């Protein structure tokens, strides 16, 4: 609550994660263009660029609401003030201002991570699984995005415990570990699931994205979510949160009764297992049996542990962030 030194190290660790993630994408995008993979190149740059542009819209709106100029209040600008405030706390209500600026940053980097990392990890797993061995530069992007998702999920988890007192039971090292391994395991099962579908027909998978994007868009509209003061700006948040629910659940508005999450993951469990049965009962000549059965074990076992970690989460635990995504 007092923005301890460990929290400052969380902020310091973030700036390396942010800069390395940005520079790796630029290096990877240049590598693709040098290697002739234009399609993989523009997509790699599009996800980081479109992810950054969306986050900048929230960042500029939040600064303007509480208040050239468009880029003067970007994500990088927020980092510099947070580092200054964190250093002042170490040298020494300043803590309340410091933690408030930190939680505002956690929201933005969660969107930045899940609007870029999730669409890119599918792309990189598509490129790594197709050519077999990949290269060193592709490994850095996969690892940093895996760290960016891992780091952002923990930092966002810490922000909830400190901002609103409702998450009082969340204190402890274990809950930030079970939830972290929750997100990796349930995503890795879904990341590999989409990639398998992404090999047979790319067009159909993107059509399924739109159907799952609209459902997420509709559900938040049904849930009457309100996060942004501006009417026009809020639909951007409604549209974005729908995209995130395509990959992982986030319990919009945090006022649900655990029913939508169960209905979401019931579709996930039968949907993921339903895909494999089609690929198992009906063999596919495209796929290779030698490498497929490692994947089939990987996708099921990760989902098997992913659900178990989710069950552990509820069996033990369950001013501005009260409207952001909460719960699991």
């Amino acid at each position, epitope marked *: 609550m007092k923005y301890t030194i460990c929290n400052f190290m969380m902020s310091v660790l973030g700036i390396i994660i942010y800069v390395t993630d940005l520079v790796a994408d630029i290096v990877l995008t240049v590598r693709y263009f040098y290697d002739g993979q234009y399609v993989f190149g523009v997509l790699t740059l599009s996800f980081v660029l479109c992810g950054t542009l969306i986050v900048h819209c929230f960042s500029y709106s939040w600064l303007k609401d509480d208040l050239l100029h468009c880029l003067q209040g970007g994500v990088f600008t927020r980092y510099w003030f947070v580092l200054r405030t964190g250093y002042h706390v170490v040298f020494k209500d300043p803590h309340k201002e410091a933690i408030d600026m930190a939680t505002d940053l956690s929201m933005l980097r969660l969107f930045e991570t899940y609007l870029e990392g999730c669409p890119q990890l599918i792309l990189q797993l598509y490129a790594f*699984l197709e*050519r*077999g*061995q990949a290269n060193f530069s592709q490994y850095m992007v996969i690892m940093v995005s895996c760290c960016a998702i891992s780091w952002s999920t923990v930092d966002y988890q810490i922000a909830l415990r400190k901002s609103l007192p409702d998450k009082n039971l969340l204190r402890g090292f274990w809950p930030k570990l079970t939830y972290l391994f929750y997100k990796l395991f349930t995503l890795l099962s879904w990341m590999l699931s989409v990639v398998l579908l992404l*090999f047979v027909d790319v067009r159909t998978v993107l059509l399924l994205l739109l159907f799952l994007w609209t459902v997420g868009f509709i559900w938040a509209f049904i849930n009457h979510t309100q996060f942004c003061n501006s009417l026009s700006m809020e639909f951007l948040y409604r549209l974005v949160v729908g995209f995130i629910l395509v990959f992982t659940f986030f319990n919009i508005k945090g006022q649900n009764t655990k029913c939508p999450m169960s209905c979401y993951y019931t579709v996930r469990v039968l949907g993921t297992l339903g895909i494999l049965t089609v690929f198992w009962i009906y063999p596919l000549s495209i*796929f*290779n049996s030698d490498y497929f059965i490692p994947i089939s074990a990987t996708i099921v076992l990760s989902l098997l542990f992913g659900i178990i970690f989710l069950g552990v989460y509820y069996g033990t635990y369950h001013c501005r962030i009260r409207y952001f995504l909460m719960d699991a």
Partner: nanobody, 126 residues
Framework: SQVQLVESGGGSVQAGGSLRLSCAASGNIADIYYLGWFRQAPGKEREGVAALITYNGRTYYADSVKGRFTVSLDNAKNTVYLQMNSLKPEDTALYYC???????????????????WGQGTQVTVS
């Protein structure tokens, strides 16, 4: 790049004749699964002429040249040889030899399937 490809045998052959092209892999190919050939001429994209598996030897072909070419691999020199018979003018193209590591996708004809390629040789048919 510990592994490199050396290609030779390209040239100009009268239509209806025969031509043999050699492609040698320098380095290690212990885990190399696929390796085949492609042809490049202006005005169209790469297409898989033929391919084979280092382990088994199943010679996957293309419908355009099925039952016409003979591709084989000899493990003594780690070299792959492709033979052409009854050449036609449309066969004139830049022929690239490439190899691919093993992976989930089993399709030894996709251009993007293969990992590293070679310089290639020119083949002319009159």
């Amino acid at each position: 790049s510990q592994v490199q490809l050396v290609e030779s045998g390209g040239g100009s052959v009268q239509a209806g004749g025969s031509l043999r092209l050699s492609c040698a892999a320098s380095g290690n190919i212990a885990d190399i699964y696929y390796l085949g050939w492609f042809r490049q001429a202006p005005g169209k994209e790469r297409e898989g002429v033929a391919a084979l598996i280092t382990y088994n030897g199943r010679t996957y072909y293309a419908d355009s040249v099925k039952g016409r070419f003979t591709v084989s691999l000899d493990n003594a020199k780690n070299t792959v040889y492709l033979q052409m018979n009854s050449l036609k003018p449309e066969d004139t193209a830049l022929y690239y030899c490439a190899a691919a590591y093993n992976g989930l996708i089993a399709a030894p004809l996709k251009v993007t399937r293969y990992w590293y390629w070679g310089q290639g040789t020119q083949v002319t048919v009159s």
